[PDB]
Amino acid sequence: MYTFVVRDENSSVYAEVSRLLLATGQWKRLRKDNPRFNLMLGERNRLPFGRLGHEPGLVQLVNYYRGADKLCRKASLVKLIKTSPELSESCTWFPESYVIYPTNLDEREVFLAAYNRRREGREGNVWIAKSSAGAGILISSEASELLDFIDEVHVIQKYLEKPLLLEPGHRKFDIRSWVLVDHLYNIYLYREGVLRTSSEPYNSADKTCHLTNHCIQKEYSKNYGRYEEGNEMFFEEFNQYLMDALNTTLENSILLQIKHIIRSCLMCIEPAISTKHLHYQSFQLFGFDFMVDEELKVWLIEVNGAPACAQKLYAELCQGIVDVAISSVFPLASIFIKLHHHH
Amino acid sequence: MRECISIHVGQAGVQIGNACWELYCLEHGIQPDGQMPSDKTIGGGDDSFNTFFSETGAGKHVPRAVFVDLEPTVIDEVRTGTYRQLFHPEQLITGKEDAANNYARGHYTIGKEIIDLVLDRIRKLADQCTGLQGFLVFHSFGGGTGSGFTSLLMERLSVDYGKKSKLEFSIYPAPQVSTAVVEPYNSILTTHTTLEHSDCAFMVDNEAIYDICRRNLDIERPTYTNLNRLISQIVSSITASLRFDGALNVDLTEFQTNLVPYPRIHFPLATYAPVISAEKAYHEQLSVAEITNACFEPANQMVKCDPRHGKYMACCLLYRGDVVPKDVNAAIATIKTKRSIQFVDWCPTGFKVGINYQPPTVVPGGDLAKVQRAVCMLSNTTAIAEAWARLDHKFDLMYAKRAFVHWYVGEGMEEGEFSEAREDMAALEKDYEEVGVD
Amino acid sequence: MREIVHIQAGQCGNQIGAKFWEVISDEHGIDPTGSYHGDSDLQLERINVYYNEATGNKYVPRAILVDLEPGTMDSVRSGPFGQIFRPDNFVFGQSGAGNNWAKGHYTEGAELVDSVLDVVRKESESCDCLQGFQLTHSLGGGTGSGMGTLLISKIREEYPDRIMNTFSVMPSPKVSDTVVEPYNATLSVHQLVENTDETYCIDNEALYDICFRTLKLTTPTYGDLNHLVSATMSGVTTCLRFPGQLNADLRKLAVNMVPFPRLHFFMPGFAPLTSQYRALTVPELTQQMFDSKNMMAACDPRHGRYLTVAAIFRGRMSMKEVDEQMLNVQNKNSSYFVEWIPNNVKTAVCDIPPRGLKMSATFIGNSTAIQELFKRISEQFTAMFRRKAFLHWYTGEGMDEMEFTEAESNMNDLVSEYQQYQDA
Amino acid sequence: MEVIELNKCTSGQSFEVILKPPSDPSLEEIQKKLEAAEERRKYQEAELLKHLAE
Ligand SMILES: Nc1nc2c(ncn2[C@@H]2O[C@H](COP(=O)(O)OP(=O)(O)OP(=O)(O)O)[C@@H](O)[C@H]2O)c(=O)[nH]1
Ligand SMILES: Nc1ncnc2c1ncn2[C@@H]1O[C@H](COP(=O)(O)OP(=O)(O)CP(=O)(O)O)[C@@H](O)[C@H]1O
Ligand SMILES: Nc1nc2c(ncn2[C@@H]2O[C@H](COP(=O)(O)OP(=O)(O)O)[C@@H](O)[C@H]2O)c(=O)[nH]1
Ligand SMILES: c1ccc(Oc2ccc3nc(NCc4ccco4)[nH]c3c2)cc1
Ligand SMILES: [Ca+2]
Ligand SMILES: [Ca+2]
Ligand SMILES: [Ca+2]
Ligand SMILES: [Mg+2]
Ligand SMILES: [Mg+2]
Ligand SMILES: [Mg+2]
């Protein structure tokens, strides 16, 4: 009889995981402050990692990797890529980004140095500013509006002016991939992804057709749910489209780059967050957001450390979390692609 | 030559003191009767080992040590033990009734009645010293004597020896080997009143020693004897610089200079390697690189925590055995490329290294196997604040209900001292977070 | 040298106290004449805790035998180990207490109490460092209940800084002598609330059910009930009498078991309880030790929450297996332990098993479910007191109705204090 | 990777390697607290004796 506690009520993913554990009749839920647990479905902010693994005779497991915020924060991800030799500033799959601290508090002069090179060389000089405190995103081709908007920590990265547009619609999209890292640091890519598509035609000359967020398309877009249900296209349809329109598959044109990027990011921070020889063990589910340009090149946008799932895929993914991440440590009485690597 | 006086308080302090002095005698070639053949200056001298041993005209080498306990059965083990001939009765101080795991009983009720006797016996040892460095204080956090009387003694030592340094070896409480429940109270009470009186304190979590004994020594249920032998090895590696010829950590002041930039943050993390089972007939001897890399494994730390999620203020590597500086620098360069070692911005990123060529001594018939080289790392990392957060949380759980508080109030303590001590720990926890987190 | 002074008062107190000295004299190898005849120095290491050493290597129990009738103490002096007690320590009257708390506490007992204190003083004077006292008595009679709590009060006046522990037999209508037992027990409980540090609540109803339902005795006697009490008393004092993991005195033991001064009433338990040659495994010892059927207070622990729990295992057994079983028991009862006292379940071992058992386990629970015992006594008290039934036996000894009203309110407060920590 | 302050002797040696440059109460007051706690003990015991005298 295993014990677990729930400390994030707003987690739609682990509310289903907690539901599955009880349904096995072999997991008993405790109060959120009971320290005698086997599994902690912890909170997002200030998870007390320092109190884990100190109960005698209890193998303790937590659903978050301490230190993984370095990958799941806007400014932290930019610094991590520029300062890690494994990724380097010459990284080919991450857009040219810069960390800009507001003036009421940095890479301001370095950002404008590369900005003037694009303005002079007739190249497309459109950038985008964003931060982790968003629902507030500004897309502009003038550097003055970007630096003034931040003063009112943010990152300014190159806006992908040539995105792959789905037809019919001439519309933008993005790919969400769910990745589960277990206590042995095995990297499992969920076989099912989602394309959160824009329902408005992409206009290169209004942010509704430029931001593919599921909440923006359901609040400010008038074509919501027209082409696909909920602006969510799954891999089967998107693969069928790539074969008919581009004469290629999702695996060849996109998924190889996605698997490469997931491995590079997670292997980079492995020595900093691994719980291999630690007094407690961690797993964590990650949400990777990708962009595909018109040349079928995949770009990493951001990594979500507390991601939600698609309604159609909640049951399958949450069962997989119990299978490989929970029952592998606490055995009872594949839907993932294992991205192999060197520990 | 400058002398050091060791003070052992309570059961944990006394039994660990007994383990350390046994090991000291084995390292210095001192027999149980006190005789030291290799010592040619009979009846005196100012050698390095004389910092811990005085000498009689008859040739006996007497530990500069005081044993104090509020109950006699543990110190009676010293009086009739193998090394009974080392000590004279003036060094062994026992009461008749202990503090019953009650800080207030050790600090106020019983401590007030014996504190002057202890200070007098300490004064007798200080009178034999031509240049006293200070004191090494061994005690538990959880015992009523180890917590209550120690803090009272530390207050008076700052009064009677204001210029002297004071270092602690403190046993942090672990439920796996403890049959008590009020130890979070005693630990926080004693840390509060001792904080301004201690220059450098080495915390040893019994949880960490227990698991090292189980994992590396294959002891299913480690005893206090198993724990104290391992602890004495760590203590010996820390004090070896005071007892042998050398240039690093040669006096107590150098410990604070090398390890404690901010006075309140004076709890260095100790890590030791290798710990090898003596039942293994033949074990492959680890290299300098392997034992140095092991200094950054949490499984070898005296307190379980994650230094990856903190910042270092100072680092000292103390090697014993067949070690040359070239191999040390080669290991450090490899470790920097593979380990997450972040120093604070206002400190240099470096390592002070000490090497003593004599390999680690083990107790004959013990559980620790003889090794060719060993290292103890002393690092002042903010990650050790995880141990304060655990302790302070257990304090808060009980104190919110005032559980067990009546035992302390009944001995003359006020409830305000509880919250005063807890507020000091809250400020200590905030100091660590300001130093080690961005 | 940490001596304990033992006092037994009244019929129940002297009969259970006599069995206790028979059991531990056998464990320490002391024969009915006070001569040691053991085969292990472990038997004599802490012999001074309970025995005085006399001339000729004779060991004399540090025991004082008190009664207001001579009857039971003559049975003791004619019992098996009757000759081992110091003759001067038999202090008795002739009138009896008539199962009346007022007679033991205020009239008949007051005339004898000073001569008992003279013997207590003589035994304390020859103690190098007195740990404290233990008293055996029932709460339903007159001598053990009334004079016993009077003795406790006068001992605290003279020895205010000494631990006072009791083994207190609670009355039950199932195993009852007189109807006035709820009166006597309610008056005594308030004395124990104020003047003891540990009180082991031994419910005669629970002892009866264990003899009947478990041990399969269709007609249990007091001798059968007292066998359970001797084995429990031996188990809880093992850590004081034999060398082992624990070397705590009474004060340290109480400090870690009693988080609030008035909530010091413990539910004792013992395992095995067999009706017999089969070896009992560690999982069996641990599961029975936490089963309500092995509890001796007739309270359901699942109806409250544990403040603290102590478990003492005796015999040669695997400690790794014990730790694993204690973990599994705590998981099954996770919702029955308070969360605001960390690590409040403690385990201890002694290598010497009792007579006739390869291994045994003794349970000490400080549970809020003990309020069910005080509620039971309180309802029976009120059922009679609302009609002032049988009160004339007490007003005839000088007591007033207000003292009963205040005793009733004191126990309702005790019940409410348990209820406030069960909800927290 | 600079090695500085190398000191050698017969029984060992010591040095320092830099990888990167940087970027009390009086005896009177103690006696007051010890005696104040003993006075609270005497007061609590006196109240017990008063309670027992009643
Ligand atoms: N490592 C180690 N820890 C010990 C030893 N003895 C006791 N402890 C720990 O110390 C704590 C109990 O405090 P003690 O030192 O035994 O008590 P004390 O200092 O004698 O004070 P009193 O309450 O008066 O007995 C528990 O956490 C024990 O785990 C020992 O020999 N070695
Ligand atoms: N450099 C770039 N070029 C083109 N489009 C970009 C871009 N950076 C961001 N976007 C667009 O912004 C949208 C979301 O941006 P971002 O990922 O920062 O918001 P967010 O983090 O709140 C979404 P999530 O819920 O997955 O965390 C994406 O749909 C993407 O199309
Ligand atoms: N367990 C047990 N209970 C007893 C024994 N003798 C009496 N009792 C109980 O004690 C109460 C009677 O008190 P008793 O000790 O006989 O009166 P006293 O002599 O005035 O103290 C009743 O509740 C009885 O059930 C005994 O030998 N064993
Ligand atoms: C760890 C620590 C202690 C443990 O067991 C205990 C706990 C509390 C106790 N109180 C007593 N008093 C018995 C007595 C003597 C005279 C009258 O009653 N015995 C105890 C044993 C178990 C594990
Ligand atoms: Ca000499
Ligand atoms: Ca000072
Ligand atoms: Ca008369
Ligand atoms: Mg985001
Ligand atoms: Mg002690
Ligand atoms: Mg009777």
PDB file of C-alpha atoms in Angstrom, chain A residues 1-3 28 30-36 38 54-58, chain C residues 305 326-328 330-339 342-344:
ATOM      1  CA  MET A   1       0.000   0.000   0.000  1.00  0.00           C
ATOM      2  CA  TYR A   2       1.661   3.172  -1.268  1.00  0.00           C
ATOM      3  CA  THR A   3       0.947   6.702  -0.053  1.00  0.00           C
ATOM      4  CA  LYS A  28      -3.758   5.776  -0.463  1.00  0.00           C
ATOM      5  CA  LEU A  30      -2.894  11.499   2.545  1.00  0.00           C
ATOM      6  CA  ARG A  31      -3.334  15.070   3.723  1.00  0.00           C
ATOM      7  CA  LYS A  32      -1.220  17.674   1.939  1.00  0.00           C
ATOM      8  CA  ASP A  33       0.985  18.219   5.025  1.00  0.00           C
ATOM      9  CA  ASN A  34       1.556  14.560   5.933  1.00  0.00           C
ATOM     10  CA  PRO A  35       5.322  13.940   5.553  1.00  0.00           C
ATOM     11  CA  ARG A  36       5.012  10.125   5.455  1.00  0.00           C
ATOM     12  CA  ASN A  38       5.891   7.815  -1.057  1.00  0.00           C
ATOM     13  CA  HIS A  54      14.432  12.394   5.207  1.00  0.00           C
ATOM     14  CA  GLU A  55      11.663  10.055   6.400  1.00  0.00           C
ATOM     15  CA  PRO A  56      13.248   6.800   7.647  1.00  0.00           C
ATOM     16  CA  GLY A  57      12.420   3.746   5.567  1.00  0.00           C
ATOM     17  CA  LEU A  58      10.370   5.672   2.986  1.00  0.00           C
TER      18      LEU A  58
ATOM     19  CA  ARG C 305      -5.600   9.973  17.191  1.00  0.00           C
ATOM     20  CA  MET C 326       6.433  -0.733  12.096  1.00  0.00           C
ATOM     21  CA  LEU C 327       6.468   1.140   8.778  1.00  0.00           C
ATOM     22  CA  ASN C 328       3.629  -0.995   7.413  1.00  0.00           C
ATOM     23  CA  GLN C 330       1.926   3.209  10.403  1.00  0.00           C
ATOM     24  CA  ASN C 331       0.771   3.169   6.772  1.00  0.00           C
ATOM     25  CA  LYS C 332      -2.374   1.229   7.696  1.00  0.00           C
ATOM     26  CA  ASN C 333      -3.013   3.716  10.534  1.00  0.00           C
ATOM     27  CA  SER C 334      -1.692   6.852   8.801  1.00  0.00           C
ATOM     28  CA  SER C 335      -4.871   8.809   9.570  1.00  0.00           C
ATOM     29  CA  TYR C 336      -4.706   7.917  13.294  1.00  0.00           C
ATOM     30  CA  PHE C 337      -1.454   9.731  14.175  1.00  0.00           C
ATOM     31  CA  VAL C 338      -1.306  13.474  14.773  1.00  0.00           C
ATOM     32  CA  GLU C 339       0.821  15.233  12.159  1.00  0.00           C
ATOM     33  CA  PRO C 342       7.076  14.550  14.065  1.00  0.00           C
ATOM     34  CA  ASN C 343       8.405  11.010  14.533  1.00  0.00           C
ATOM     35  CA  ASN C 344       5.947  10.311  17.364  1.00  0.00           C
TER      36      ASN C 344
END
